C-alpha cells in the first residue's frame, strides 16, 4: 500500500538509488540473481555478436578488414579455418554463436528467477548455498569451487589443442595452419621462466610467448595449479598472518577482484598489441611493429629490384637506409622502425640468420609470398580514425578500416583503467567501513582533535 | 507613482526568470547571438568568404559547422544589414558573412548585459558583487580574442570563426604563425586554467572526504541542511591532512575561496594581454641568442628550433587554402618537407 | 615492543610533520632519486640522440638552453622500449648520449607518484577520514602515466614519450596533433570541457562564497580575519549565495546542498581529466580523432572543403616537417 513498504528504498537500506546495487550486499539470493543474470548478459553478447559478425562476414575477405573480433577468437582455436587462415567452413562460427545465445536464455531465466522470485536470502533456505561474508571458511570454500571451475576451463583449452583438432599455428612449417599439439612444454623452467622475464623491450614478459607448445603446457600447469588451489581452499581456512593482513567484507573482496581484473585488462591490452601468436595476424591484422617492419621490407624489396645494394646503402643520417645494427649488433631494418627490431613473424624469419637479417638471403631468397605479405601488412597498419577512416591522421576518406588490435587494445585499456579506479574506490571505502567512519567524522569524537599539533 | 518607478517595480519582481533593467539589454542580445549561431550553422555557407562549406544544410556535422568570418576584403566593416555592402539584402548579407559581426557584436553587448545582471541581482539580494568581478575575465578574453585581435590584423577574416573545428584551426594557426605556446602570457593563462581546475577538484574532494557524520545514511548527501549553522566538514582535519601530505594547507576558509576566485580569473586576464600583443604580431616568437647560435652552428639543436620547423611546415602547408584571398601558389618544389614524408 | 614494532609505529605515526607511511617508504627514495637526477640533468646533461639517428639534441642550461627551451631529453629511438639503466651502458658518457637520465627519472617518478596517491589513501585512513581524495588525484596521475609510459608503449619507444621540459612539451603536443588529430578526438574535447569547466566552477564557487561572507570585520582590515581556524560556525551565508545563483540562472540549476555542490566540484574536472588521460592512452594505439577529410563532395565530385580540411592542411605541415631526418619510407607508421 505504501511506496516505502518494501526494503527497496533509501529509507530502509541506507543507500540512494544511484548506489542501489549496494542494497544487495547482504541479500544473497537476490545477489545470486544479479550475478547469474549478468552472466546471462555476457553470454548473450558473445552469441549475438558472433551471429552478427557471421551475417556480415565475407569469408574470402580478410577478417581484419571486416571489423571482426569474435570470429578471430574462434578461428584461433582451429575452428573454421585451414592453411594460411583461409575460411574453409563458417558453420563452426555459427554453432559457437547459436549455442552461446541459447545458453544466455537459461542463465537469464535463472537470474530473473533468483532476482525477483526466489528466496531473497539463502541462509535460512540452505546452509550450503547461504553465506556470511565474514565467514572466512565458507568464502575460501566458494573461492575453491570457482578455482576448480577455472582449472577445468584451462584444461578444456588443452584438450582442444591436443585431442580435438589442435589450434591455429601461425608458425607452422610451410605456412600457418591448424596443428595438433602433441608435445606441450611441461618443463617448469620454461613455463615459470616466462613469468620472471622483464616486461621491457625485447623481453616482453609472458606477452612474448611465441609457440603453441609453451601455451598449451602453460595451460596444463595453470589448470593443475587452479584445481589443486581450489581443493586447498575448500579444505582449509585463512591463516593468522592472512587474517591480520586483509579486510574481511563483501566490498573488500570486490575491491580485490577489481584490482585483479584491472591488472588483467592492462595485460590483455599489451597481449593483443604485441603478440602475433595467440593473436595471429592472419585474423587480427599485423601488429604496429609488424606493419612498420613490413614497410621497410617492402621498399627494401622494390629498391633491390631496381638495382640497389641495400647492405651498403648509406642513408642521410649516416645510418643505413635499409639495414643497420641494433644496439647489441644484430642486423635490423633501417629508418624509424629501428625501434621495432624485436619483432618476429613467420614471413620475416626466413630472412633471419645468427647475426640478424642475412644479406645473402635478402639478395637471393625473398619469395613472392613474402613480398605480398609485407605489402598487405604495411597497408593494413593499425592506424585509423574513430570513424574508421583507415590510415594516418592526415589520410583522405576512402578506406573503411580500423585494425581489430586497435579496437581491442583501446577498449581494454579504458576498461582496465576504470577498474583500477573502482579498485581504489571500493578498497578505500572497505577500509573506512570496516573501521567505522565511511559515513564521516564523529563530531563528538574527532580523532585529529586528540592529536598533538604538528607545530 | 511615476511610470519610471512602476517600471522599476515590474522589472525587479522575483519571478522565475528575473528580468531587471539589465535584462532589457541581456535578453535580446543573448538571444540574437545564440539564434544567430544556430541559424548560421544550420543553414548558412562560407563559400563566398572562405571557399568552405559550414552548415548542416551542406553536409557538415556538429564538429565541422561554423558561422565563419567575413572575407578579408571586407576589412573591419561592421557589415550591418543596411550597410553599404549588403545594402539591406538579407541573403547577400548572409553570403558576405554578416552573421559573423551580428553574432560577435550582439554577443559583446550580451556579455555586458549579463555582467550587469550579476551586479543588479547582487545588489538586490544584498551580497558583495564578486561574481560580476570574476566575470570580468570571460569579458577580457572575448573582447581581446574576438574584437581587438582581428582589429589589429588585416580584417575580421582572421578573427576566430564560431565553430568547433574552426576554433581548432584558430589554435593551430596561432601555433604556426604566432608561436603562441612560447608566449609567457599564454603560459600564465595555462597555469591559471589548469590551476583553477586543480583547485576545483582538490577542494571538492577535500570537503567530501572530511565530512562530519551528520546522519545514518551511507549516502551522505541527505545529512545537510542549508540553514544549519555548523560547517559540514572538518577544516581542522582537512588542514592536518594536507599539511602532512603536501607540506602546506589552507587554514582560512575565506582566503581559500578568494584564492579560488583569484587563480583562473588572473590567468584568463594574462592570456588576454598576450592576445592583445598578437593583434599587432607582437609575438614571443623567437629567442635571438638561440638563432644566432643555430645560424652559426649546424650541430646545435634544441626543442625550440624543432618547434620552429614545425611552425614553418604549418605556415607553408596551410596558408594557400586558409588564406585564399592571397592567391598563394606554392609549387611542390618550394614546400618544406623532411626526408620521405 | 621490539625494534620492528617501534619502527612501524614511527612510519605510520599521525604525529610526523610530514606523514611517512608504507607507501612513503617507497615514495621518498624514488622521488628523491628522480628529483636529484632531474636537476642535475636539466643543468648539465650533454646533448641526447633522441631519435636514434646520431643527431643529438641539447636539453640542458649549460649546453645552450634557457628555462623555456631546456629539457631532459627522451631516450634514444635505437633503445625503443628496452630497459636502459646505468649499468647497461659501457660508461656514463654512453648513458648520457643515449638519454638514460630520462628513463631513470620517469620510472622513479611514476613509481613515486603512484605511491603518493597510495599515501593519500593511507593518511586518510589514519586520520579517520573518508578515503577518496586519492581518487581525485588519480586523474593527473593517469595523465602522467599516459604521456610518460603508455604512449611510448603503444608507439614502441620512449623516444616518443613527453620530454621533461617546456618547449619539449609543446613539441610533443604538436607532433601528437599531426599523428592523431587529437583536437578532433572526443576524449580530448571532454578533457577541455573538464579543465575549462573546472576553471569556471572554481572562479564561480570562489566568487559566490566570497560574495556572501558574513560581516565580521571593519573596513580597515582584511575580511579574512573574520574567519578563525577551527571555528564551528560556517563563515558565509550559503542561503544568500544560493539565492543569488538561482536568480542569476533559474532557481533549480543552483545547488543549495553544499555536499552535492562540492561533489560536483570534485567530479567535473576529475572525470574530464580521466577522459583526457584515456584520450592519450587510446591514441597510444592509434585510434585517432575524427577524420572528415574530403567528407563534403558536390554533385560533380569536387571536394568542398570544411574547417576539418584546413585542420588537415595544418596537420600535414606538422607531419612533413617533424623529425626531418628520421624517415626513409613514405608512411610514418609509428
Amino acid at each position: 500500500n505504501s511506496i516505502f513498504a518494501t526494503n527497496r528504498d533509501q529509507e530502509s537500506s541506507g543507500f540512494a538509488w544511484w548506489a542501489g546495487n549496494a542494497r544487495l550486499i547482504n541479500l544473497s539470493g537476490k545477489l545470486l540473481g544479479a550475478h547469474v543474470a549478468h552472466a546471462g548478459l555476457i553470454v548473450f553478447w558473445a552469441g549475438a555478436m558472433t551471429l552478427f559478425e557471421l551475417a556480415h562476414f565475407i569469408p574470402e575477405k580478410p577478417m581484419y578488414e571486416q571489423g571482426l573480433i569474435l570470429i578471430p577468437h574462434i578461428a584461433t582455436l582451429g575452428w573454421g579455418v585451414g592453411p594460411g587462415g583461409e575460411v574453409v567452413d563458417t558453420f563452426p562460427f555459427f554453432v559457437v554463436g547459436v549455442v552461446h545465445l541459447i545458453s544466455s536464455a537459461v542463465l537469464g531465466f535463472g537470474g530473473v528467477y533468483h532476482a525477483i522470485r526466489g528466496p531473497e536470502t539463502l541462509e535460512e533456505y540452505s546452509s550450503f548455498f547461504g553465506y556470511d561474508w565474514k565467514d572466512k571458511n565458507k568464502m575460501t570454500t566458494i573461492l575453491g569451487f570457482h578455482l576448480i571451475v577455472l582449472g577445468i576451463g584451462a584444461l578444456l583449452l588443452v584438450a582442444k589443442a591436443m585431442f580435438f583438432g589442435g589450434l591455429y599455428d601461425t608458425w607452422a612449417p610451410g605456412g600457418g595452419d591448424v596443428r595438433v599439439i602433441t608435445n606441450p612444454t611441461l618443463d617448469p623452467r620454461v613455463i615459470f621462466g616466462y613469468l620472471l622475464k622483464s616486461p621491457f623491450g625485447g623481453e616482453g614478459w609472458i606477452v612474448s610467448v611465441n609457440n603453441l607448445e609453451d601455451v598449451v603446457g602453460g595451460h596444463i600447469w595453470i589448470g593443475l595449479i587452479c584445481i589443486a588451489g581450489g581443493i586447498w581452499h575448500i579444505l582449509t581456512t585463512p591463516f593468522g598472518w592472512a587474517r591480520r593482513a586483509f579486510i574481511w567484507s563483501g566490498e573488500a573482496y570486490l575491491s580485490y577482484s577489481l584490482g585483479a581484473l584491472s591488472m588483467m585488462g592492462f595485460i590483455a591490452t599489451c597481449f593483443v598489441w604485441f603478440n602475433n601468436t595467440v593473436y595471429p595476424s592472419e585474423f587480427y591484422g599485423p601488429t604496429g611493429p609488424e606493419a612498420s617492419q613490413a614497410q621497410a621490407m617492402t621498399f627494401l624489396i622494390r629498391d633491390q629490384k631496381l638495382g640497389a645494394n641495400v647492405g651498403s646503402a648509406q642513408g642521410p643520417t649516416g645510418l643505413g637506409k635499409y639495414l643497420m645494427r641494433s644496439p647489441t649488433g644484430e642486423i635490423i631494418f633501417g629508418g624509424e622502425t629501428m625501434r621495432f627490431w624485436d619483432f618476429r613473424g613467420p614471413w620475416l624469419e626466413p630472412l633471419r640468420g645468427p647475426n640478424g637479417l642475412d644479406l645473402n638471403k635478402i639478395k637471393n631468397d625473398i619469395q613472392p609470398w613474402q613480398e605480398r605479405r609485407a605489402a598487405e601488412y604495411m597497408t593494413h597498419a593499425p592506424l585509423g580514425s574513430l570513424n574508421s577512416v583507415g590510415g594516418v591522421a592526415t589520410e583522405i576518406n576512402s578506406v573503411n578500416f580500423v585494425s581489430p588490435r586497435s579496437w581491442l587494445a583501446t577498449s581494454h585499456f579504458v576498461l582496465a583503467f576504470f577498474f583500477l579506479v573502482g579498485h581504489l574506490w571500493h578498497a578505500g571505502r572497505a577500509r573506512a567501513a570496516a573501521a567505522g567512519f565511511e559515513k564521516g567524522i564523529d563530531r563528538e569524537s574527532e580523532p585529529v582533535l586528540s592529536m598533538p599539533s604538528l607545530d | 507613482r511615476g511610470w519610471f518607478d512602476i517600471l522599476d517595480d515590474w522589472l525587479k519582481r522575483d519571478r522565475f526568470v528575473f528580468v531587471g533593467w539589465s535584462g532589457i539589454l541581456l535578453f535580446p542580445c543573448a538571444y540574437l547571438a545564440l539564434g544567430g549561431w544556430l541559424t548560421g550553422t544550420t543553414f548558412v555557407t562560407s563559400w563566398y568568404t572562405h571557399g568552405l562549406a559550414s552548415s548542416y544544410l551542406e553536409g557538415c556535422n556538429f564538429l565541422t559547422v561554423a558561422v565563419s568570418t567575413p572575407a578579408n576584403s571586407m576589412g573591419h566593416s561592421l557589415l550591418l544589414l543596411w550597410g553599404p555592402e549588403a545594402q539591406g539584402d538579407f541573403t547577400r548579407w548572409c553570403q558576405l558573412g554578416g552573421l559573423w559581426t551580428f553574432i560577435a557584436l550582439h554577443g559583446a553587448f550580451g556579455l555586458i548585459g549579463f555582467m550587469l545582471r550579476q551586479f543588479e541581482i547582487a545588489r538586490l539580494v544584498g551580497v558583495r558583487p564578486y561574481n560580476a568581478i570574476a566575470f570580468s575575465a570571460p569579458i577580457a578574453v572575448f573582447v581581446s580574442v574576438f574584437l581587438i585581435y582581428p582589429l589589429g590584423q588585416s580584417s575580421w577574416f582572421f578573427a576566430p570563426s564560431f565553430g568547433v573545428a574552426a576554433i581548432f584551426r584558430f589554435l593551430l594557426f596561432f601555433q604556426g604563425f604566432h608561436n603562441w605556446t612560447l608566449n609567457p602570457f599564454h603560459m600564465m593563462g595555462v597555469a591559471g586554467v589548469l590551476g583553477g581546475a586543480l583547485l576545483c577538484a582538490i577542494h571538492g574532494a577535500t570537503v567530501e572526504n572530511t565530512l562530519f557524520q551528520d546522519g545514518e545514511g551511507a549516502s551522505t548527501f541527505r545529512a545537510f541542511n542549508p540553514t544549519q549553522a555548523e560547517e559540514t566538514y572538518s577544516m581542522v582535519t582537512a588542514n592536518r591532512f594536507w599539511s602532512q601530505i603536501f607540506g602546506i594547507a589552507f587554514s582560512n576558509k575565506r582566503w581559500l575561496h578568494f584564492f579560488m576566485l583569484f587563480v583562473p580569473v588572473t590567468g584568463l586576464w594574462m592570456s588576454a594581454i598576450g592576445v592583445v600583443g598578437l593583434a599587432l604580431n607582437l609575438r614571443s616568437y623567437d629567442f635571438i641568442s638561440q638563432e644566432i647560435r643555430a645560424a652559426e652552428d649546424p650541430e646545435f639543436e634544441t626543442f625550440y628550433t624543432k618547434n620552429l620547423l614545425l611552425n614553418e611546415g604549418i605556415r607553408a602547408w596551410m596558408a594557400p587554402q586558409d588564406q585564399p584571398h592571397e592567391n598563394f601558389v606554392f609549387p611542390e618544389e618550394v614546400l618544406p618537407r623532411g626526408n620521405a614524408l | 615492543a621490539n625494534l620492528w614494532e617501534r619502527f612501524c609505529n614511527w612510519v605510520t605515526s599521525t604525529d610526523n610533520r610530514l606523514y611517512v607511511g608504507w607507501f612513503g617508504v617507497i615514495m621518498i627514495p624514488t622521488l628523491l632519486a628522480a628529483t636529484i637526477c632531474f636537476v642535475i640533468a636539466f643543468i648539465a646533461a650533454p646533448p641526447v640522440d633522441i631519435d636514434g639517428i646520431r643527431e643529438p639534441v641539447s636539453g640542458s642550461l649549460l649546453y645552450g638552453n634557457n628555462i623555456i627551451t631546456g629539457a631532459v631529453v627522451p631516450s634514444s629511438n635505437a633503445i625503443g622500449l628496452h630497459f636502459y639503466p646505468i649499468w647497461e651502458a659501457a660508461s656514463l658518457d654512453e648513458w648520457l648520449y643515449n638519454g638514460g637520465p630520462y628513463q631513470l627519472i620517469i620510472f622513479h617518478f611514476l613509481l613515486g607518484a603512484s605511491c603518493y596517491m597510495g599515501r593519500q589513501w593511507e593518511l586518510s585512513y589514519r586520520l579517520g577520514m573518508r578515503p577518496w581524495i586519492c581518487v581525485a588525484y588519480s586523474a593527473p596521475l593517469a595523465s602522467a602515466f599516459a604521456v610518460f609510459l603508455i604512449y611510448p608503449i603503444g608507439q614502441g619507444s620512449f623516444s616518443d614519450g613527453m620530454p621533461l621540459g617546456i618547449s619539449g612539451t609543446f613539441n610533443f603536443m604538436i607532433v601528437f596533433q599531426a599523428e592523431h588529430n587529437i583536437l578532433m578526438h572526443p576524449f580530448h574535447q571532454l578533457g577541455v570541457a573538464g579543465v575549462f569547466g573546472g576553471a569556471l566552477f572554481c572562479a564561480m564557487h570562489g566568487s559566490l562564497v566570497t560574495s556572501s561572507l558574513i560581516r565580521e570585520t571593519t573596513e580597515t582590515e582584511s575580511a579574512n580575519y573574520g574567519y578563525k581556524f577551527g571555528q564551528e560556525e560556517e563563515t558565509y551565508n550559503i542561503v544568500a549565495a544560493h539565492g543569488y545563483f538561482g536568480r542569476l540562472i533559474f532557481q533549480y540549476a543552483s545547488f543549495n546542498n553544499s555536499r552535492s555542490l562540492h561533489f560536483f566540484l570534485a567530479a567535473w574536472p576529475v572525470v574530464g581529466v580521466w577522459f583526457a588521460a584515456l584520450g592519450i592512452s587510446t591514441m597510444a594505439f592509434n585510434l585517432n580523432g575524427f577524420n572528415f577529410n574530403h567528407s563534403v563532395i558536390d554533385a560533380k565530385g569536387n571536394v568542398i572543403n570544411t574547417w576539418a580540411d584546413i585542420i588537415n592542411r595544418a596537420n600535414l605541415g606538422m607531419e612533413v616537417m617533424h623529425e626531418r631526418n628520421a624517415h626513409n619510407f613514405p608512411l610514418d607508421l609509428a
Partner: peptide, 30 residues
C-alpha cells in the same frame, strides 16, 4: 651568467619551500 641566474632563482624557490613548510605560522584552533 644566464645559467647562474636560472639556477639561482630555482634555488631560492626551493629554499622558500623549506621555510614555507617548516617555518610556517602554525595553525591554531580558537
Amino acid at each position: 651568467m644566464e645559467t647562474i641566474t636560472y639556477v639561482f632563482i630555482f634555488a631560492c624557490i626551493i629554499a622558500l619551500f623549506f621555510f614555507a613548510i617548516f617555518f610556517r605560522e602554525p595553525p591554531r584552533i580558537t
